[PDB]
Design a protein around this nucleic acid. Structure first.
Lengths: 149, 794, 150, 305, 383
RNA sequence: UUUUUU
């Protein structure tokens, strides 16, 4: 029940930690709710790594949890409010292609999770992932490629 | 066509088949294809709860199948498909099934015939038997067994008989058993036998359990069989094992509806906290009856609990999942499906009332009344009577509401109160007072006694007797805690009498210890009206500005400030324009009044702008007219804006424009006024002003004859009123005195007397002085202007 | 607009309808709950075992007439069979990401070898419907003991 | 999983004030694609989308006040417009010159709609009636009557034989043109409607009221098939796709959504306007959308087939 | 298309399956495209997809497999990858028998030990075709800065016949000995552009090895202006028409303006830290020869073929995974191979640019020539 | 200190 009890504008930023593929760190100017959701996800990851390593697999818990590299969570959280791209570009030192990349890789995952919440039977996760996805794709981050048109 | 049909896309296949039929008419395969296409469309129609379309499609499919059967009546598949069509209309709420079967099917080929439900099912069974006669296969045997099962089910469900359908059930079991022994390796036959074995008329659960287990073993990927076992366990008080079967079944097929409904039922029985969400998910998948009723029940029950509206249970679920509209649509579908169950109707009425769909709520309560005519329990019938009568009273037709409230035992507070309100609405104020006092007799919950006292005050005031109403409201004030409604009613009553003495005391009482009131606009209105009574007329605007300063939000407050500035102290026109624009910006639904007031303020201002387009008075009043074309004030504003624009163009001296629209706007004003309930004095003022403005506009443009005919018609309509006659004088005397001419003293004295007829109007006097200047009697003009000056100053 | 005084007089003293006494709340209505799980039972119908297939002149095939034959690849489904004979699918559907559907044979694998030669038409095997009824679901430990029906 | 939706053209300032209605007509048998827009002016500018852009073709004007509805015809080259001017002057679309002029005030006409064969041009009046004029043939042959309130929306089923009319306060009336007899009156919403549309083949009627919901009724009965709620303010227009799978709705919250009737869900939202969006339409074989807004702009979108 | 059946062309790179789509729709009829986000016309007869989508619609039925004839695996030498080599083998196993296979490759040594496996996994004979003698052969030079103002001297270290010339290296080492951070590199690039602009071998693609260096040296170059007036008009008109669809704020932010400034002179950058709308414009203005100098990176080196006039490298070792590895022969061959253009020049020149220390010809031998790679199998288990 | 796909 980690994600179910949050706002839809925080679950997108919480899930931005699986896709960014950029040098990661925690944050300081973060709400309390995000600063604890990050810990809850990391604890769930610790449990999964503990059931992997205590079973016979050779992948230490540190190696599994090191794929989670947050550090664009706050940037995605600010993007999913109505914040134009320029302020995000200013915000932090990550190249402006690798940000559109991560957002492109997240708005397509919060939509297969919108498709999976109907399968598990959580219509409140369905009704929150169908909001966090439709509010994430509006502008030049999702500009159509020239070749196709 | 057949290939397109294979992939869905039924419409294209139907069109292709029809084109083929147009050329050749006896082409059997095209006829057969048309029949299956209509049958599939009918089944898809029945998956969503559209029961009329399905009947239409099946009727047409029978048409096509008989057309095919005239030519080749040795083929089996045609007979079998006919039987499928006939028997797929079970559970379609009879009195919705009237099917126009025609021809060979009914033995001899006579004309046409309209068949009801049982007859249709019998014809289906006959068709399956005939098909089986000439080609004995297992599938037809199984289908025949199912048809006999459906006939027995239909007979029982209408309570038409019992113990006289035994042979039908034994025949059904015989057919299913024959099918199973014909090929005992098919999960379908075992499953069908199991389901029939557990019918209420037979009740052999061991055989049913055996059949479902054999079906599961025969083919392991079977959600249907697992859910049927789950039901078998669940009805016989085995919650745990039924839970096991349902959970595994949905593990095998995540989008099967019945397993989810069973899970919801189990969760409800054991009292979990996520049962409501489970029902919501069930609603999201597809429309089943059981899930529908469950979700509606939970939505209504949650609405009842009034300690919720901070919980984030109520807030999120109801107000962000739009639970109420979903429940309404769900219940509409359910009720059309079942239509013999009263609580469904009552919940539908409750939800419709919350959507302010009052007419449909009245219909729902009406149907519930009809259902409950005869029943063991009469209290629910009385409660239904109160509710239907209350909604009937809410929207006109008071006589019907009164009759409904008569036909009930008037002994509980709710029923008596509703009767009182209906009586008051029709008239009969004495009767309403009697009902309210009688209700006061049996009263707890002192809030209710205070409210009844206030209603008594209102109703007796209506007759007159303000003194007793006043004393009664003070008596209410003597109660332990005031209600903010007796104090507010007292202030309004004080204002209704032109004395501010008690109104001030009541206002101070209201403000002192009341903060739980959450209007914050009504108190400002009362304070401002109180100040206006004393004629202060400058404090009023200052007071409203103070209120807006306290609470800089609330578009309503800004709009009220704009309106008062337009009415009282119209020298801060610029501030009023700014206020109206601000009120319009801060929302959209206050557009109407705010735009009206800001347009009027711009009118008052003059032309104090940079001669900028898109922000003149005409544009804003036009915007308001587009937003709400219902009130007459916007149309009058349009008249004023057109005239003002004419004058501005005249000042720049380029061209008069927008020439002839006054008559249309006047007709619009009258038509719009006709539908306003009562602001009688205000409505009269508006119509009078519009008439005068239209006449003056007609004079200005130059269409003297039209103004003349308008005035003549108006005076022929009603007896004389000394205002319009002045307009007739003005229209008369325009040709004359435009060219120099001498006038006879008779007309001049007549005009002076006419002006005296309608005095207390500075315009008229100024116009008369202009007349004096025209002929030239200056000192007399000076005197007329002086009289106007004295009148204005006073 | 109307002046303040008459506006207030209409707003409050027009009728007692505005009182919280006559509102939608202030009734405390109740309903009774009636479940019906017997409606959950679902029975599916059998397919049509015939097609009315065309005929062909043995040379330069021409439609002599349409004769009915028995279908052979019915009772085959998209979620329980991996062959290129199964019905097409549910409907127009998501191209990928679909659990509960079977891929076709992987090409190095055929896995069809059986005869099951009975081929009867009166193949009634004389199954016993009342002697010894098995009451254990596949995977569970115990079923239910129902009284026998005579 | 959605298709590739996106803008193709953006006219910067079409008119000088708000644009209040739009009509797209593939009138001629070849690919003409003429777009006619009316605004808070006398201007009735007539654009043509030739290959990749809108080029202004006609700027005809005879009106005095803002235009509230415009319409185009599929058979003839012709157009009609009404305004607060109390005039129904209908243009020619070939030389850019007026053809006729009908006197009618807000008690005789509010909004336009041509016939399926573009012959009668019914309009909704104030006292409740629907007045059916005759183009090229005079005035006011007959008027259908519904005992109701001000009537805002007028729609014709694509095949004829049905006429629908929304009103202030919500009630909806469905007539059949064959006999002129009220089939049935639905109650719909509780506040004014101001937009209606049938579906091609005329078995699905889509309303859009002032509270944000989009009822989807079903014709030949009173069944409703669901309520689409996804907007945050008024809904001002609904245009139904040429293929019976989607429809487009423009709301007063500066957003153009595209729904589909199969699953009653919003597939794609366009966030491109900056003020209230007063008009949306499809084109011929529906693959592009026009959206005129309160801010003077003309958007043309791309909905691939 | 002649047989009415369907064919699937599958490409690994998301950016490679866009221009292939453009060219296949331009060459004939209907070509649908499927990728992670694009789904243009998923009913055509030349669907172009990424292999993970074919692997995902092989596990389900998807009813497209019912109509296939050919599956055109484009670059089947990505099986050697470490995190995606299992996809090609899950696909090559799950394919039904009625679907014929085409495997384009890049001349690997053990081609008969791989096609035999695919031949006996199925039950069909597989034909192996390998060719040699690519057109417009390539000459490998080496440029060492000297007299950076105008004079540029190039030493030839490899020729169109594969013979290594140690004499040129001898000259280079002698010169370096006789000789005895960014300011020298700026003169190096201006000496390169001075010796390159004097001839007509102008449209030069620089390969930088870090995105900061990639746009940094293009910033530090700061005066080329290689474009005429009509090319100015066409560049500006096309780029503004393509960029002017989207809204206002989105068209004034630092990279858009700065990159537009670079393209105005006839300079571009193509690293991975730019908006995809800028990568795509760089390629479409480079595919018609209206941009004159491109500071590209390896992504341009992989996703396309697009022959250009002059390819110039910048270093020998790039860090990949904690290694600071030098270019392996297999890698180098691709980037060098797309050096010559077709019929617009006799040959194509690949210029190595050692600046820091001695070139160390021993490892230059294995970099500039060497057997590309065997064909491994990175099969592994996933959930 | 480069590159990549559901």
């Amino acid at each position: 029940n980690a994600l179910s009890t949050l706002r839809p504008e925080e679950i997108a930023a919480l899930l931005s930690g699986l896709v960014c593929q950029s040098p990661g760190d925690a944050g300081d100017q973060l709400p309390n709710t995000l600063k604890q959701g990050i810990e809850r996800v990391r604890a769930v990851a610790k449990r999964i790594g503990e059931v992997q390593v205590a079973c016979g697999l050779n992948q230490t818990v540190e190696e599994f949890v090191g794929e989670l590299n947050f550090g664009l969570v706050e940037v995605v959280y600010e993007w999913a409010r109505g914040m134009p791209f320029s302020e995000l570009a200013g915000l932090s030192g990550t190249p402006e292609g690798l940000v559109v990349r991560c957002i492109q890789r997240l708005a397509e995952m919060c939509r297969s999770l919108r498709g999976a919440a109907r399968l598990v039977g959580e219509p409140v996760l369905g009704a929150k992932m169908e909001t966090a996805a439709t509010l994430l794709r509006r502008d030049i981050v999702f500009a159509a490629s020239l070749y196709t048109q | 066509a057949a290939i397109q049909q294979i992939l869905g896309k039924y419409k294209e296949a139907v069109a292709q088949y029809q084109m083929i039929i147009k050329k050749k008419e006896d082409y059997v395969p095209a006829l057969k294809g048309l029949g299956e296409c209509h049958l599939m469309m009918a089944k898809a129609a029945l998956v969503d709860y559209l029961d009329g379309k399905a009947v239409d499609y099946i009727e047409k499919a029978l048409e096509y199948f008989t057309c095919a059967l005239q030519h080749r009546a040795d083929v089996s598949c045609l007979w079998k498909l006919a039987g499928d069509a006939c028997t797929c209309l079970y559970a379609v709420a009879p009195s919705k099934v009237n099917v126009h079967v025609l021809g060979v099917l009914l033995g001899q080929k006579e004309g046409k015939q309209v068949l009801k439900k049982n007859e249709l099912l019998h014809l289906g069974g006959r068709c399956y038997g005939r098909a089986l006669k000439l080609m004995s296969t297992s599938n037809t045997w199984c289908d025949l067994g199912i048809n006999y099962y459906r006939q027995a089910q239909h007979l029982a469900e209408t309570g038409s008989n019992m113990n006289d359908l035994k042979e039908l059930l034994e025949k059904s079991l015989h057919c299913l058993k024959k099918a199973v022994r014909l090929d005992s390796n098919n999960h379908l036959y075992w499953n069908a036998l199991g389901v029939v074995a557990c019918y209420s008329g037979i009740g052999n659960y061991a055989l049913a359990q055996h059949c479902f287990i054999k079906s599961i073993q025969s083919e392991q990927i079977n959600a249907v069989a697992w859910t049927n076992l789950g039901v078998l366990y669940l009805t016989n008080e085995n919650i745990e094992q039924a839970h096991e079967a349902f959970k595994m079944a949905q593990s095998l097929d995540p989008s099967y509806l019945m397993c989810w409904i069973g899970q919801a039922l189990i969760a409800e029985a054991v009292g979990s906290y996520d049962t409501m969400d489970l029902f919501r998910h069930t609603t999201e998948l597809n429309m089943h009856t059981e899930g529908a009723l469950g979700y509606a029940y939970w939505v209504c029950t949650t609405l009842q609990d009034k300690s919720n509206r901070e919980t984030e249970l109520y807030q999120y679920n109801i107000l962000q999942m739009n639970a109420i509209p979903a429940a309404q649509v769900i219940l509409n579908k359910y009720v059309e499906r079942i239509q013999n169950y009263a609580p469904a109707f009552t919940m539908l009425g409750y939800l419709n009332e919350h959507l302010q769909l009052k007419k449909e709520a009245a219909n729902a309560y009406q149907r519930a009344i009809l259902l409950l005519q005869t029943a063991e329990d009469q209290d629910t019938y009385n409660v239904a009577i109160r509710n239907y009568g209350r909604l009937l009273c809410s929207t006109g037709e008071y006589d019907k509401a009164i009759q409904a409230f008569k036909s009930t035992p008037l002994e509980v507070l709710e029923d008596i109160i509703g009767f009182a309100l209906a009586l008051f609405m029709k008239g009969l104020y004495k009767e309403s007072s009697k009902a309210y006092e009688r209700a006061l007799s049996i009263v707890e919950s002192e809030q209710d006694k205070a409210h009844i006292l206030t209603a008594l005050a209102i109703t007796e005031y209506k007759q007159g007797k303000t003194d007793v109403a006043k004393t009664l409201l003070f008596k209410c004030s003597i109660l332990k805690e005031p209600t903010t409604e007796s104090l507010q009613a007292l202030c309004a009553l004080g204002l209704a009498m032109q004395d501010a003495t008690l109104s001030k005391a009541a206002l101070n009482e209201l403000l002192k210890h009341i903060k739980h009131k959450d209007s914050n606009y009504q108190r400002c209105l009362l304070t401002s009206a109180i100040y206006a009574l004393q004629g202060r007329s400058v404090a009023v605007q200052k007071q409203i500005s103070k209120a807006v300063h306290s609470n800089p939000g609330d578009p309503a407050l800004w709009s009220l400030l704009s309106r008062v500035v337009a009415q009282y102290a119209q020298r801060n026109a610029k501030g009023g324009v700014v206020a109206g624009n601000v009120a319009h910006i801060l929302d959209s639904n206050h557009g109407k009044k705010a735009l009206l007031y800001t347009a009027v303020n711009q009118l008052a201002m003059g032309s104090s702008s940079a001669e900028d387009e898109k922000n003149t008075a005409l544009k804003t009043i036009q915007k308001a007219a587009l937003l709400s074309p219902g009130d007459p004030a916007i149309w009058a504003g349009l008249m004023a804006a057109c005239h003002a624009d004419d004058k501005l163009a005249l000042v720049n001296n380029t061209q008069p424009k927008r020439i002839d629209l006054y008559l249309a706007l006047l007709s619009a004003v009258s038509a719009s006024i006709k539908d306003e309930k009562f602001f009688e004095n205000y409505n009269q003022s508006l119509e009078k002003w519009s008439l005068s403005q239209a006449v003056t506009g007609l004079i200005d443009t130059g269409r003297i004859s039209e103004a003349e005919t308008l005035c003549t018609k108006n005076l022929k309509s009603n007896p004389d009123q000394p205002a319009v006659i002045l307009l007739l004088r003005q229209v008369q005397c325009k040709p004359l005195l435009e060219s120099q001419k001498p006038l006879p003293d008779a007309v001049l004295e007549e005009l002076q007397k006419t002006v005296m007829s309608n005095s207390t109007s500075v315009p008229a006097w100024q116009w008369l002085a202009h007349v004096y200047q025209s002929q030239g009697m200056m000192r007399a003009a000076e005197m007329c202007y002086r009289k106007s000056l004295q009148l204005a100053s006073q | 607009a109307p002046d303040l005084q008459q506006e207030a007089e209409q707003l409050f003293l027009s009728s007692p309808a505005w009182l919280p006494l006559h509102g939608v709340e202030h009734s405390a209505r109740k309903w009774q709950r009636k479940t019906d799980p017997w409606s959950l039972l679902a029975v599916l119908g059998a397919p049509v075992p015939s097609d009315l297939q065309a005929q062909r002149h043995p040379t330069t095939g021409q439609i002599l007439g349409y004769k009915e034959v028995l279908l052979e690849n019915t009772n085959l489904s998209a979620t329980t069979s991996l062959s290129l004979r199964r019905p097409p699918g549910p409907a127009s559907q998501s191209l990928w990401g679909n659990p509960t559907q079977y891929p076709f044979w992987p090409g190095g694998m055929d896995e069809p070898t059986i005869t099951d030669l009975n081929t009867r038409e009166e193949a009634e095997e004389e199954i016993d419907f009342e002697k010894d009824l098995l009451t254990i679901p596949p995977g569970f430990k115990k079923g239910m003991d129902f009284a026998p029906k005579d | 999983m959605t298709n590739q939706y996106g803008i193709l053209f953006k006219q910067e300032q079409a008119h000088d004030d708000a644009i209040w209605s739009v009509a797209w007509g593939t009138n001629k048998k070849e690919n003409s694609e003429t777009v006619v827009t009316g605004s808070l002016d006398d201007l009735v500018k007539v654009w043509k989308w030739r290959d990749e852009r809108l080029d202004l073709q006609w700027s005809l004007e005879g009106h005095q006040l803002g235009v509230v509805s415009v319409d185009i015809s599929h058979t003839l080259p012709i157009a009609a417009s009404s305004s607060l001017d109390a005039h129904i002057r209908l243009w020619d679309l070939e030389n850019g010159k007026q053809i006729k002029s009908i006197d009618a005030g807000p008690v005789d006409a509010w909004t336009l709609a041509f016939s399926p064969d573009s012959q009668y041009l019914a309009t909704g009046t104030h006292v409740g009636k629907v007045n059916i004029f005759g183009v090229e043939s005079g005035k006011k042959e007959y008027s259908l009557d519904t005992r109701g309130k001000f009537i805002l929306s007028i729609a014709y089923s694509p095949d004829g034989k049905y006429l629908a009319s929304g009103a202030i306060d919500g009630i909806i009336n469905i007539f059949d043109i064959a006999t002129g007899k009220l089939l049935h009156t639905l109650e719909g919403h509780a506040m004014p409607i101001r937009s209606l549309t049938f579906s091609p083949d005329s078995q699905l009627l889509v309303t859009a009221s002032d509270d944000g919901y989009i009822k989807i009724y079903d014709v030949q009965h009173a069944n409703l098939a669901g309520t689409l709620s996804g907007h945050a303010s008024w809904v001002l227009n609904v245009a139904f796709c040429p293929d019976d799978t989607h429809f487009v709705s423009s709301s007063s919250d500066k957003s153009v959504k595209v729904w589909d009737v199969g699953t009653r869900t919003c597939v794609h939202t366009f966030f491109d306007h900056q003020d209230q969006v007063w008009g949306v339409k499809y084109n011929g074989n529906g693959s592009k959308i026009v959206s005129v807004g309160d801010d003077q702009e003309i958007h043309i979108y791309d909905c691939p087939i | 298309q002649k047989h009415m059946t369907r064919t699937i062309y599958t490409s690994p790179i998301k950016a490679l399956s866009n221009q292939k789509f453009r060219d296949f729709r331009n060459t004939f009829g209907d070509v649908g495209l499927l990728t992670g986000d694009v789904q243009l016309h998923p009913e055509a007869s030349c669907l172009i997809m990424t292999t993970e989508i074919l692997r995902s619609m092989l596990y389900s039925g998807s009813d497209v497999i019912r109509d296939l004839e050919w599956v055109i695996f484009d670059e089947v030498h990505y099986i050697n990858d470490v995190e995606r080599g299992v996809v090609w083998e899950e696909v090559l196993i799950m394919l039904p028998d009625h679907v014929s296979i085409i495997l384009l490759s890049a001349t690997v040594p053990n081609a008969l030990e791989f096609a035999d496996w695919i031949g006996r996994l199925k039950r069909r004979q597989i034909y192996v075709i390998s060719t040699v003698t690519r057109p417009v052969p390539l000459e490998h030079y080496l440029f060492t800065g000297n007299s950076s103002k105008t004079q540029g001297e190039l030493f030839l270290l490899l020729d169109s016949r594969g013979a290594f010339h140690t004499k040129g290296y001898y000259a280079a080492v002698e010169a370096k000995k006789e000789r005895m951070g960014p300011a020298q590199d700026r003169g190096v690039y201006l000496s390169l552009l001075a010796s390159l602009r004097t001839r007509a071998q102008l449209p030069v693609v620089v390969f930088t090895f870090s995105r900061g260096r990639c746009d940094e040296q293009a910033s530090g170059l700061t005066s080329l202006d290689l474009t005429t007036s009509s090319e100015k008009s066409e560049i500006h008109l096309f780029l503004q028409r393509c960029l002017a669809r989207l809204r206002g704020s989105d068209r004034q932010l630092p990279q858009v303006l700065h990159m537009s400034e670079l393209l105005n002179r006839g300079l571009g950058v193509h690293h991975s830290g730019i908006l995809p709308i800028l990568k795509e414009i760089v390629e479409m203005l480079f595919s018609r020869g209206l941009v004159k100098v491109l500071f590209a990176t390896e992504t341009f080196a992989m996703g396309v073929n697009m022959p250009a006039r002059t390819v110039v490298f910048d270093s020998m070792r790039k860090h990949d995974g904690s290694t600071f590895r030098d270019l392996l022969p297999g890698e180098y061959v691709q980037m060098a191979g797309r050096a010559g253009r077709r019929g617009l020049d006799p040959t194509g020149t690949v210029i190595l640019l050692c600046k820091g220390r001695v070139p160390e010809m021993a490892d230059l031998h294995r970099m500039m020539m060497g057997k590309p790679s065997q064909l491994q199998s990175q099969f592994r288990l996933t959930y």
